[PDB]
């Protein structure tokens, strides 16, 4: 139930990790630009990691688009769900982690009634 | 008939590479019986198949094939350049592949 859109292509499907993250525990897996005078990553040698650049972006037509073709929208109540009544073709509901099951079931029922796709249907539900 | 072959033997030499930089996206295939580009300009556009075998059945058979096509000639020894849908695992530098006769223009 997605509008006709061009095939989503990603110029870099990998994750940009900080240098020496796998070497030192203090260095977390969050990108930080190397500002050292003799940093090989900063000097962009051959065989090292790749810094994020402006060219690694994505097409604006297929930006913020899930693989199912529906944009992700965070909802918290039935009133929030009513917002995407005439925009179910491009936006998909997503229940946040702070909603209990007693409201999750009602939200799912309303989404089914209004034909709104939910990205997390099996959330906090009995197995 | 003791022989049932509808393809041409080929050897996977290496990728299109340089002294210190290699390009896995394009491979080099040597054809038996071909020695010059003049006769190498016959197996162009043909489909090359790597037919390997695994120990786990996927969809009823344990034999899996990787497909590609001949793009152009490489060198004066009859070697040709090949582009595959999935690049060869680079462990097959010398393996035998099957160049089929289709699409056939002759």
């Amino acid at each position: 139930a997605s509008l006709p859109h061009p095939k989503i292509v990603k110029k870099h499907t990998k994750k940009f990790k900080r240098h020496h993250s796998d070497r030192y525990h203090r260095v977390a897996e969050n990108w930080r630009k190397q500002k050292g005078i003799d940093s090989v990553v900063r000097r962009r040698f051959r065989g090292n990691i790749s810094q994020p650049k402006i060219g690694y972006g994505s097409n604006k037509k297929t930006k913020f688009l899930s693989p199912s073709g529906h944009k992700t929208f965070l909802v918290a109540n039935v009133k929030d769900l009513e917002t995407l009544t005439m925009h179910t073709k491009t936006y998909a509901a997503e229940i946040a982690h702070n909603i209990s099951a007693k409201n999750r079931v009602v939200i799912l029922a309303r989404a089914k009634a209004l034909g709104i796709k939910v990205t997390n249907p099996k959330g906090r539900l009995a197995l | 008939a003791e022989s049932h072959r509808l393809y041409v033997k080929g050897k996977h030499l290496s990728y299109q590479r340089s002294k210190r930089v290699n390009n896995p996206n394009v491979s080099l295939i040597k054809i038996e019986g071909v020695a010059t580009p003049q006769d190498a300009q016959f197996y162009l556009g043909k489909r090359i198949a790597y037919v390997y075998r695994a120990s786990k059945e996927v969809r009823g058979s344990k034999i899996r094939v990787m497909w590609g096509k001949v793009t152009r000639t490489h060198g004066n020894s009859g070697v040709v350049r090949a582009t595959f849908r999935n690049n060869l695992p680079a462990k097959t530098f010398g393996a035998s592949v099957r160049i089929f006769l289709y699409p056939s223009n002759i």
């Binding site: - | 059945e57 969809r59 009823g60 058979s61």
Partner: protein
């Protein structure tokens, strides 16, 4: 933990060359083994098929002490207490029910091929 320890011929049965004969650890392990045997007997498990299926030794909080060195320096002289746990089980493993059916997906060409083989072979 066999760095810079002596070698012996009593450990040849295990394939190693460096082995020792601990005393306090052996007594503690034997006591816990007898406790486990008593627990199993109280529960109702016969000792005929009882085997030690799990054992674990962890490091307990250290009992800090003191030592005296040259030039009036104070150094670190604590112990390394052990937290020991073990589980014995009755051994019983004859056979299982294997895996599920693992339904395979067949292409039309594959189905035709198997049909041809069935029709041709007796």
């Amino acid at each position: 933990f066999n760095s810079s320890i002596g070698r012996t011929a009593q450990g040849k049965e295990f394939g190693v060359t460096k082995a020792r004969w601990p005393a306090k650890s052996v007594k503690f392990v034997q006591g816990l083994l007898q406790n486990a045997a008593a627990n199993a007997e109280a529960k109702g498990l016969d000792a005929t098929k009882l085997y030690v299926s799990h054992i674990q030794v962890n490091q307990a909080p250290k009992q800090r002490r003191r030592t005296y060195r040259a030039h009036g320096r104070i150094n670190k002289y604590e112990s390394s207490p052990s937290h020991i746990e073990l589980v014995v089980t009755e051994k019983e493993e004859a056979v299982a029910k294997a895996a599920e059916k693992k339904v395979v997906r067949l292409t039309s060409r594959q189905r035709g091929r198997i049909a041809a083989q069935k029709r041709i072979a007796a």
